[PDB]
Amino acid sequence: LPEDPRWELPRDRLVLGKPLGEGAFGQVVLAEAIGLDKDKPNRVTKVAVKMLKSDATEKDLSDLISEMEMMKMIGKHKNIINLLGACTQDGPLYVIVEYASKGNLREYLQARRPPGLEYSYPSHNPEEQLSSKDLVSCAYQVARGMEYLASKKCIHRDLAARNVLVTEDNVMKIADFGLARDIHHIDYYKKTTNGRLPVKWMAPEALFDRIYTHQSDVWSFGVLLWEIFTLGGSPYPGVPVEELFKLLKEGHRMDKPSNCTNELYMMMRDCWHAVPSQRPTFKQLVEDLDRIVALTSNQE
Ligand SMILES: COc1ccc(C(=O)Nc2cc(-c3ccccc3)[nH]n2)cc1OC
């Protein structure tokens, strides 16, 4: 591997800790980086470190390098997982990225659901709660991250609350935007770690015609809005792949969540326009969401 001094961190400056990943986005450990920034070299930063498994192939290594390379080209934004450094020389490749202490958006929302009642699946009682303005702010931050990625000509292809990470400061950060586009596939029947089907976030033209655009990421963002307003709800529970295809061919759309305004449901429906050119762009969604955040009550 060739050395890039823009990103090189000496190996003795990384203190590897507990695994974080294989929960989702590859082989990942939590770590402490000493002196990531030149001002100063005496401070530690908790970081996430992406690396290869023992049974990794030449394609497994080339995909990690490409993801790292893509992150360098995309550059920095507050609403994406940023690249912080790399250990490329004299040992296993380590890709150092931002650590989001509150986990993914689906987990974060589920843990903040209102307390369990006598009819619930009843002991659920968080010490953490979200207002309607907080939920709209979450949607705004994801749209901002996507608008930035789109401005850098990046098409995500897998936007979902599972790929949005939450920092200690409740900042939303889009993850997995730099992953290498697989060829051909993918397995429509392959489930996530929590038993969900990624096809449930895919635009019909991406699913049926294999056409991925910024417009198909806007469809995914509509499903992500639905995930926000259901506080981490699962789209189409109990619906297998073959039945989802039939619902899509019939123009079926998910029902309005109860914790949602008519305006926000019409935003979801607009993201789900059958005609890709008719969907709002991320630039429009950012503008609409900024206006809505300012008018949404934080009193309930
Ligand atoms: C308190 O619970 C949790 C706290 C933190 C995590 C977590 O994984 N954080 C994480 C993962 C990455 C990363 C970003 C991009 C690529 C690879 C990894 N950055 N930050 C998971 C948790 O529960 C499962």
Q: Please state the φ and ψ torsions of residue 247, each to the nearest 5 degrees.
A: -65, -40
Residue with tokens 């506080």: 231
Q: Please state the φ and ψ torsions of residue 173, each to the nearest 5 degrees.
A: -130, 120
Q: Is the CB of 175 under 6 A from ligand 1?
A: yes
Q: Is the CB of 23 under 6 A from ligand 1?
A: yes
39 included as an active-site residue: no
Distances (CA, A) of 198 to 99, 105, 164, 185, 195: 24, 15, 14, 13, 10
CA angle, residues 231, 289, 196, in degrees to nearest 5: 30
Report whether 162 contacts 142 (CB < 8 A). Answer: no
Q: Is the CB of 260 under 6 A from ligand 1?
A: no
Question: For atom 1 of ligand 1, which residue has the closest CA?
Answer: 102
HSE-up of residue 41 (Cα within 13 Å, Cβ side) = 5
Question: For atom 7 of ligand 1, which residue has the closest CA?
Answer: 103
SS3 (DSSP) at 162: helix
Closest CA to 220 of 145, 160, 147: 160
CA–CA gap between residue 85 and residue 82 (Å, rounded): 9
Instruction: Give residue 163 CA to ligand 1 midpoint distance, Å.
Output: 10
22: its two tokens: 């294989």
- Breaks in the chain after residues (C–N exceeding 2.5 Å): 121
CA–CA gap between residue 26 and residue 67 (Å, rounded): 12
HSE-up of residue 67 (Cα within 13 Å, Cβ side) = 30
CA–CA gap between residue 160 and residue 202 (Å, rounded): 10
Instruction: Give residue 77 CA to ligand 1 midpoint distance, Å.
Output: 18
Instruction: Give residue 93 CA to ligand 1 midpoint distance, Å.
Output: 19
Question: For atom 3 of ligand 1, which residue has the closest CA?
Answer: 103
Mutate to test the pocket of ligand 1, among 22, 27, 28 (most ligand atoms within 8 A of CB): 28
CA angle, residues 197, 220, 281, in degrees to nearest 5: 170
122: its two tokens: 């009843």
Instruction: Give residue 258 CA to ligand 1 midpoint distance, Å.
Output: 29
160: its two tokens: 């979902």
Whether cis (ω within 30° of 0) applies to the bond prior to 40 is yes
Torsion sign (Cα): 63, 69, 74, 75: positive
81: its two tokens: 């997982």
Question: For atom 6 of ligand 1, which residue has the closest CA?
Answer: 103
CATH, domain 1-99, list 3.30.750.80, 1.25.60.10, 3.40.50.970, 3.30.200.20: 3.30.200.20
CA–CA gap between residue 78 and residue 173 (Å, rounded): 7
Torsion sign (Cα): 278, 283, 287, 290: positive
Report whether 25 contacts 51 (CB < 8 A). Answer: no
Instruction: Give residue 28 CA to ligand 1 midpoint distance, Å.
Output: 8
Residue type, 200: K
- Residues comprising the chain, all counted: 300
Q: What CATH number is given for 100-294 in this structure?
A: 1.10.510.10
Instruction: Give residue 96 CA to ligand 1 midpoint distance, Å.
Output: 13
Closest CA to 74 of 158, 224, 175: 175
In the chain, alpha helices (H): 58-74, 105-111, 132-151, 204-209, 214-229, 241-249, 262-271, 282-295
In sequence order, the β-bridge partners of residue 15 are 32
* Reported structure resolution in angstroms: 2.0
Helix axes 282-295, 262-271, angle to 10 degrees: 170
Q: Is the CB of 94 under 6 A from ligand 1?
A: no
User: Largest alpha-carbon pair distance within the chain?
Assistant: 60
CA–CA gap between residue 41 and residue 59 (Å, rounded): 35
Closest CA to 200 of 143, 152, 140, 159: 159
Mutate to test the pocket of ligand 1, among 64, 82, 99, 192 (most ligand atoms within 8 A of CB): 99
CA–CA gap between residue 167 and residue 45 (Å, rounded): 13
Catalytic residue chosen out of the listed positions 4, 12, 90, 158: 158
* Other beta carbons less than 10 A from residue 24's beta carbon: 17
CA–CA gap between residue 85 and residue 182 (Å, rounded): 25
Q: Is the CB of 20 under 6 A from ligand 1?
A: yes
Domain range list for the chain:
1-99, 100-294
Q: Is the CB of 200 under 6 A from ligand 1?
A: no
